[PDB]
Enzyme design. Sequence first.
Site, PDB file in Angstrom:
ATOM      1  N   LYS D  10     -45.193 -41.317  10.579  1.00 41.04           N
ATOM      2  CA  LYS D  10     -44.587 -42.284   9.640  1.00 41.04           C
ATOM      3  C   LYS D  10     -43.734 -41.530   8.634  1.00 41.04           C
ATOM      4  O   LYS D  10     -44.199 -40.522   8.085  1.00 41.04           O
ATOM      5  CB  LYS D  10     -45.613 -43.163   8.939  1.00 41.04           C
ATOM      6  CG  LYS D  10     -44.977 -44.383   8.294  1.00 41.04           C
ATOM      7  CD  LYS D  10     -44.555 -45.469   9.233  1.00 41.04           C
ATOM      8  CE  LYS D  10     -45.673 -46.442   9.518  1.00 41.04           C
ATOM      9  NZ  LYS D  10     -45.397 -47.313  10.685  1.00 41.04           N
ATOM     10  N   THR D  57     -48.728 -45.008  13.905  1.00 42.86           N
ATOM     11  CA  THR D  57     -47.957 -44.640  12.702  1.00 42.86           C
ATOM     12  C   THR D  57     -48.482 -45.502  11.553  1.00 42.86           C
ATOM     13  O   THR D  57     -48.571 -44.989  10.439  1.00 42.86           O
ATOM     14  CB  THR D  57     -46.444 -44.737  12.940  1.00 42.86           C
ATOM     15  OG1 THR D  57     -46.049 -46.098  13.067  1.00 42.86           O
ATOM     16  CG2 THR D  57     -45.993 -43.936  14.142  1.00 42.86           C
ATOM     17  N   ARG D 176     -12.561 -19.437 -13.487  1.00 36.02           N
ATOM     18  CA  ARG D 176     -12.601 -20.752 -12.807  1.00 36.02           C
ATOM     19  C   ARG D 176     -13.849 -21.501 -13.263  1.00 36.02           C
ATOM     20  O   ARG D 176     -14.760 -20.924 -13.864  1.00 36.02           O
ATOM     21  CB  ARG D 176     -12.593 -20.561 -11.286  1.00 36.02           C
ATOM     22  CG  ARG D 176     -13.854 -19.923 -10.726  1.00 36.02           C
ATOM     23  CD  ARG D 176     -13.788 -19.787  -9.216  1.00 36.02           C
ATOM     24  NE  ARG D 176     -15.063 -19.344  -8.712  1.00 36.02           N
ATOM     25  CZ  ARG D 176     -15.413 -19.310  -7.433  1.00 36.02           C
ATOM     26  NH1 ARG D 176     -14.527 -19.591  -6.484  1.00 36.02           N
ATOM     27  NH2 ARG D 176     -16.635 -18.914  -7.114  1.00 36.02           N
ATOM     28  N   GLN D 228     -22.052 -16.261  -3.633  1.00 41.29           N
ATOM     29  CA  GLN D 228     -22.878 -15.310  -2.855  1.00 41.29           C
ATOM     30  C   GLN D 228     -23.607 -14.374  -3.833  1.00 41.29           C
ATOM     31  O   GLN D 228     -24.838 -14.230  -3.749  1.00 41.29           O
ATOM     32  CB  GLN D 228     -21.983 -14.543  -1.883  1.00 41.29           C
ATOM     33  CG  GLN D 228     -21.523 -15.360  -0.683  1.00 41.29           C
ATOM     34  CD  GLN D 228     -20.207 -16.080  -0.890  1.00 41.29           C
ATOM     35  OE1 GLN D 228     -19.859 -16.513  -1.990  1.00 41.29           O
ATOM     36  NE2 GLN D 228     -19.464 -16.235   0.192  1.00 41.29           N
ATOM     37  N   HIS D 256     -15.630 -27.922  -5.772  1.00 44.91           N
ATOM     38  CA  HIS D 256     -14.355 -27.399  -6.316  1.00 44.91           C
ATOM     39  C   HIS D 256     -13.838 -28.317  -7.417  1.00 44.91           C
ATOM     40  O   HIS D 256     -13.808 -29.554  -7.222  1.00 44.91           O
ATOM     41  CB  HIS D 256     -13.343 -27.200  -5.193  1.00 44.91           C
ATOM     42  CG  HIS D 256     -13.867 -26.372  -4.081  1.00 44.91           C
ATOM     43  ND1 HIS D 256     -14.184 -25.036  -4.246  1.00 44.91           N
ATOM     44  CD2 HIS D 256     -14.160 -26.675  -2.806  1.00 44.91           C
ATOM     45  CE1 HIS D 256     -14.613 -24.546  -3.094  1.00 44.91           C
ATOM     46  NE2 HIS D 256     -14.650 -25.545  -2.210  1.00 44.91           N
TER      47      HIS D 256
HETATM   48  O1  LIG Z   1     -17.688 -18.219  -4.534  1.00 41.33           O
HETATM   49  C1  LIG Z   1     -16.923 -18.352  -3.587  1.00 41.33           C
HETATM   50  N1  LIG Z   1     -17.270 -17.919  -2.326  1.00 41.33           N
HETATM   51  C2  LIG Z   1     -16.477 -18.013  -1.197  1.00 41.33           C
HETATM   52  O2  LIG Z   1     -16.904 -17.564  -0.123  1.00 41.33           O
HETATM   53  C3  LIG Z   1     -15.254 -18.694  -1.414  1.00 41.33           C
HETATM   54  N2  LIG Z   1     -14.224 -18.973  -0.557  1.00 41.33           N
HETATM   55  N3  LIG Z   1     -13.305 -19.626  -1.216  1.00 41.33           N
HETATM   56  N4  LIG Z   1     -13.712 -19.786  -2.488  1.00 41.33           N
HETATM   57  C4  LIG Z   1     -14.914 -19.198  -2.664  1.00 41.33           C
HETATM   58  N5  LIG Z   1     -15.754 -19.064  -3.722  1.00 41.33           N
HETATM   59  O1  LIG Z   2     -43.940 -47.830  19.537  1.00 40.74           O
HETATM   60  C1  LIG Z   2     -44.790 -47.526  18.709  1.00 40.74           C
HETATM   61  N1  LIG Z   2     -45.287 -46.243  18.637  1.00 40.74           N
HETATM   62  C2  LIG Z   2     -46.250 -45.802  17.750  1.00 40.74           C
HETATM   63  O2  LIG Z   2     -46.626 -44.621  17.806  1.00 40.74           O
HETATM   64  C3  LIG Z   2     -46.655 -46.785  16.813  1.00 40.74           C
HETATM   65  N2  LIG Z   2     -47.576 -46.727  15.802  1.00 40.74           N
HETATM   66  N3  LIG Z   2     -47.603 -47.888  15.203  1.00 40.74           N
HETATM   67  N4  LIG Z   2     -46.715 -48.705  15.798  1.00 40.74           N
HETATM   68  C4  LIG Z   2     -46.117 -48.066  16.824  1.00 40.74           C
HETATM   69  N5  LIG Z   2     -45.170 -48.417  17.732  1.00 40.74           N
END
Ligand SMILES: O=c1[nH]c(=O)c2nn[nH]c2[nH]1
Ligand SMILES: O=c1[nH]c(=O)c2nn[nH]c2[nH]1
Lengths: 295, 295, 295, 295
Positions: D10, D57, D176, D228, D256
């Site tokens: 779930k 589920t 920048r 980086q 940017h």
């Molecule tokens: O911080 C940056 N890293 C990059 O790899 C990069 N490439 N263009 N601008 C950038 N700025």
């Molecule tokens: O198709 C289903 N699969 C499951 O595992 C399930 N569990 N509750 N309802 C369900 N329906």
Amino acid sequence: SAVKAARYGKDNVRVYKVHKDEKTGVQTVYEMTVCVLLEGEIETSYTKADNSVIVATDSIKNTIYITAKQNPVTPPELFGSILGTHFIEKYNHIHAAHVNIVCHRWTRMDIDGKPHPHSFIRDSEEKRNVQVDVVEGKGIDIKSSLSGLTVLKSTNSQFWGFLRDEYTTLKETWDRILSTDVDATWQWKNFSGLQEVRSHVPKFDATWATAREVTLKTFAEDNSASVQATMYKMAEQILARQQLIETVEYSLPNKHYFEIDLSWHKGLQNTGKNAEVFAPQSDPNGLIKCTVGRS
Amino acid sequence: SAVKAARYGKDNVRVYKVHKDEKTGVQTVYEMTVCVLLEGEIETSYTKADNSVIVATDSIKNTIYITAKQNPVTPPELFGSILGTHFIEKYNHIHAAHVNIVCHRWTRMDIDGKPHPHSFIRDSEEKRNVQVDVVEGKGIDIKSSLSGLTVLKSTNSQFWGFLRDEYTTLKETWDRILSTDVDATWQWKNFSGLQEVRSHVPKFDATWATAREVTLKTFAEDNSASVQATMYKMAEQILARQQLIETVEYSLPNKHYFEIDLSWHKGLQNTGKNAEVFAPQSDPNGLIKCTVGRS
Amino acid sequence: SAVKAARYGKDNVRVYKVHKDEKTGVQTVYEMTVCVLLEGEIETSYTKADNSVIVATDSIKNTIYITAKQNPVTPPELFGSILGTHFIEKYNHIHAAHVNIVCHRWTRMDIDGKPHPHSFIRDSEEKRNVQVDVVEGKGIDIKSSLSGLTVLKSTNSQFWGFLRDEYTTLKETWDRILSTDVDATWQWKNFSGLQEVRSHVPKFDATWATAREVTLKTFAEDNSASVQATMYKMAEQILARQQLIETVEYSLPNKHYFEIDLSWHKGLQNTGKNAEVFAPQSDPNGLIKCTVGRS
Amino acid sequence: SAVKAARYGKDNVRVYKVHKDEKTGVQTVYEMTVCVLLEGEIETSYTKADNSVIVATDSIKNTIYITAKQNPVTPPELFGSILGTHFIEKYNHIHAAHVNIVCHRWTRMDIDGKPHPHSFIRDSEEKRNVQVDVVEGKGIDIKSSLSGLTVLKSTNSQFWGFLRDEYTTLKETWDRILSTDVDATWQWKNFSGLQEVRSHVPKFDATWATAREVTLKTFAEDNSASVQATMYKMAEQILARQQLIETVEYSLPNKHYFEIDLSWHKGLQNTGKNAEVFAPQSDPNGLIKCTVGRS
Ligand SMILES: O=c1[nH]c(=O)c2nn[nH]c2[nH]1
Ligand SMILES: O=c1[nH]c(=O)c2nn[nH]c2[nH]1
Ligand SMILES: O=c1[nH]c(=O)c2nn[nH]c2[nH]1
Ligand SMILES: O=c1[nH]c(=O)c2nn[nH]c2[nH]1
Ligand SMILES: [Ar]
Ligand SMILES: [Ar]
Ligand SMILES: [Ar]
Ligand SMILES: [Ar]
Ligand SMILES: [Ar]
Ligand SMILES: [Ar]
Ligand SMILES: [Ar]
Ligand SMILES: [Ar]
Ligand code: NA
Ligand code: NA
Ligand code: NA
Ligand code: NA
């Protein structure tokens, strides 16, 4: 400390390309969102402020638009392979290019029952995607996918025979709604390089079409015992229909539609066989995953 | 201080309804999101903690589901009219019900060229909407709309001869991309009440189909001078094709696709007649609005 | 057919401005999203492809940036007033400018208990907004708001003594959770023009600070009879504390947190005085609105 | 074909818990979104419609609320470990529980300079997260993270000395704007089981506090040579400050802010030292990733 892993580049690069047949006047449009992340001998940009090893993300963006100008952008498996191959070949110190592409739908309009030469509709937020990992010395690893394919069936879904203990409240059912957002991924055999990807170009569109057709037919026709059982049938058919795929993966939410007991109001009957009005549940949701391969 | 205006109720009520034909086995699904807000003699709930005057939002929610169980949910103009009429008729002190409905697409799947009896796809995020204002003594005011209809044409859009002054940088163009998300609203003649809405029921689906067909054909076929000039032709045609509509309103973003000058790179030509690769702009966007009525 | 209403311009214009004090080295940043829509003698742009009357949306965009360069961007009521006044003064045929501004939070960082001279955090998605309508002959109408102010109290909320009939299931409560996203708007007295706005500049930040302080204290301290009763006390106090405001409007969702009966599981007690674990409901939600003015 | 991998459960389970000190009247609230996915001997639910192996589920959802009732929900590393341990211990055939938790901010309100006993504000969409993988025979693998921490500095960011070739347009800069959304993850030493996780409980809140404090101080104080170089300094300090962490990962967009040349308009100076008004770019964005470990 030391760099164990690093990758960097440009994400969310929106690209549009048009093809114009000057003979027929028919135009075809393509729209994608591109991410390119590079690995290689770039540790020193992190550890020593050595920017000499950085191919600027801005330059990676320019390279995406230039590659789109100089090559077909379809199928996305091919475009991704060309773009990834460019970086590992151009730059001695770049050893891997990781290329993600989301393809956006632009479906040709039919106007008065004729296909229009240059007008398009976005029929659904359904995407076609690729992840192309171009690794120097280790070829090209491609995952293809469709995602955001939203479907519902109003019957011929069941869920009974599941484990029952002190944590269980769920009633068994022999007739429910089933609705999901399909995320389906097919993993290609490793390709040795761009030549081998090119050699298989028609299989990309074909296998996407197959995956989508099998998904929709199996969903529509399977009298579903569970999400699990239905998704497995889809995966096994796709594998049987394309030898160059090694695995098929599905990730499926179970988008619940709950019955509404109205018997408190004028004895209104709206459960079991009388169920007409339901409450679609936004959350929570079942989440069901499988990776299927050959036995 | 005094209450000058107040309304309250339940928003984001998700509703699904299924119709099942027992003879043919064909099932039809409807899914919507409903909001109901009430006005009337309720100021004391704000000024004097007098909750005796509140029809609980939880009770409004129950009433939406009960109404969907006991009436057709289509067309949404009728369902909204029934729902709104209920509140002003049931409760002496409620004088207005404001009903908003968003209808979600569930389009029947074609499997092997045959319409499937109980399987559906969300084939766009496009919505069909109503706003139904049921006001005691003043009848039923309905606005109908389609929204989220995303389209693009790759040529046969122009924008030249606009005002040029010291704030102007935009180049005139005789050939550009045009893309928008269509929000189109048609405002019905005031209805006296629920009987009059029932007397016009077939006109709702018909006028929605007309609005959508005119939008798509005019967008595709108009050699557009501007968003302004194209949206006006859509509104004109819709007014000409349903006399029970007083006004047609369009709200259209201009989702810009910019040319990319690549001439800095090996003299690559990608502008004017050589323009193939474009940068879709997320923001900002032109926003163009009109309301058209009868001369 | 005829144009009954039209407005057009540029939406989603992202703007950042920095102020740098060269003496103290302290920098202050402002970030907003701007929409400007124009009205005037522009119907022929729709009816006759007459673009001569269009001030290009691209030119409106340039004007927003130029205006931000040449004027203070704070308070947003003033910037909007300056921007809107520009369009109606510059262009004889433009008669109205509708300026919407969303202000994004950039709160100065405290590092080691000292305010940093040039480092900021987005400390909430809460917005401060204006809608400034500059109408030739009719002055400047300003609505000011805070929105996206998300709050919860775990007790000292009640909801009992509401209307109970055959549509009612809701249990009365004397102790519940209350959570909302505060949308609060204060509508200024009409201003004759830009001079009158300039004469009240200090009142804008002051009235925003009052609106926020009253919202938070009243929410925290009111033993709430209803959303209705609590929002009214907020609106009252704000009116009492700024005579230049005509009305205060609240729009408040009731973001429901439901008790979870766990008594089916080993007799676990998790309701009433034993309620500890709750299910936050995404939808539906109560939606409660008021406009309060002077007696 | 055959199942190569499977997991199910779930997702998007919204949970709220309140603690009430009856002595002091001070209430403390916790709100989270929980996902639990199970692995084990469940192949047959996919291959043979064998639902006997499925813990529904719906039952997994119930189990989340019951566990929340019977245990502290803080720190999330501990709650996740308890919840994951429950499934692999309760069910012989379940061999792994994968628990993701997103923690939502509810910060106590200060009203007139005093902390309020039961009123809270969502100060930012910043999250605290865990991924807890409870694997039978292989203990408990915990990744902790903070995400959605949005920051900007208006100076003391530089980017020069990067690779320049025929793909490069980017101007070197010595001054920048730098703005990012911080995603920072610390990977714990493997724990043998729930006892060992419990033995280290205070280190979870402590290390989150450290990670957040180091992130903000290094961002504010580093005269940044690149994203980086700055992110590496953050990672190495966190490693030096908690021996039980093996790796620190950062994933940082470069959001940017572009200069706007206004010299075309009345020779307006808004570049280099004269840069006051900027255009924040929604897309594309640099994306910079690092995983740092001990040398
Ligand atoms: O911080 C940056 N890293 C990059 O790899 C990069 N490439 N263009 N601008 C950038 N700025
Ligand atoms: O198709 C289903 N699969 C499951 O595992 C399930 N569990 N509750 N309802 C369900 N329906
Ligand atoms: O505060 C409240 N106001 C209402 O109108 C209401 N209706 N249900 N619950 C409610 N809570
Ligand atoms: O169609 C258009 N209408 C306009 O008003 C406009 N302004 N810039 N571009 C434009 N395109
Ligand atoms: Ar493209
Ligand atoms: Ar399925
Ligand atoms: Ar419905
Ligand atoms: Ar248009
Ligand atoms: Ar700004
Ligand atoms: Ar409230
Ligand atoms: Ar919780
Ligand atoms: Ar950074
Ligand atoms: Na290389
Ligand atoms: Na009435
Ligand atoms: Na004017
Ligand atoms: Na087990």
